[PDB]
Design a protein around this ligand. Structure first.
Ligand SMILES: CCCCCCCCCCCC[N+](C)(C)[O-]
Length: 122
């Protein structure tokens, strides 16, 4: 592809496990040092949203998938959320690299229920 970015096998496996095995609540992904591959930084079974927030970087970008459960009234449901985490304070170079590499990861995952772009401020 143009980006030349590869999605590590672990990324696919973690996503599949979360979707098919329901044995993971969330996964946080990051670019490797050479910016040639997206890898897994963290995976968790913790259902507490605050714990998830605690695993997101304050000064760097990341991507994440979260198995979101909610109740609208017709039966507890869930949606796999694809998240682009790009803090306002993160270096412009990083925001650019992650923005340019996002589609590579996104197109590798099927079954995404909601796409979220989050820009947190200090
Ligand atoms: C409607 C849900 C929106 C959730 C957005 C999350 C807001 C909390 C941002 C705190 C970021 C956590 N931190 C400092 C450790 O990086």
């Amino acid at each position: 592809s143009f980006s030349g970015v590869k999605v590590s096998p672990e990324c696919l496996e973690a996503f599949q496990e979360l979707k098919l095995g329901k044995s993971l609540r969330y996964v946080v992904f990051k670019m490797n040092d050479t910016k040639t591959e997206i890898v897994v930084e963290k995976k968790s079974t913790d259902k507490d949203f605050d714990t998830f927030l605690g695993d997101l970087p304050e000064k760097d970008c990341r991507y994440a998938i979260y198995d979101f459960e909610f109740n609208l009234g017709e039966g507890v449901r869930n949606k796999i959320i694809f998240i682009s985490w790009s803090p306002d304070v993160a270096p412009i170079k990083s925001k650019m690299v992650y923005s340019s590499s996002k589609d590579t990861l996104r197109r590798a995952f099927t079954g995404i229920g909601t796409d979220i772009q989050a820009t947190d401020f200090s």
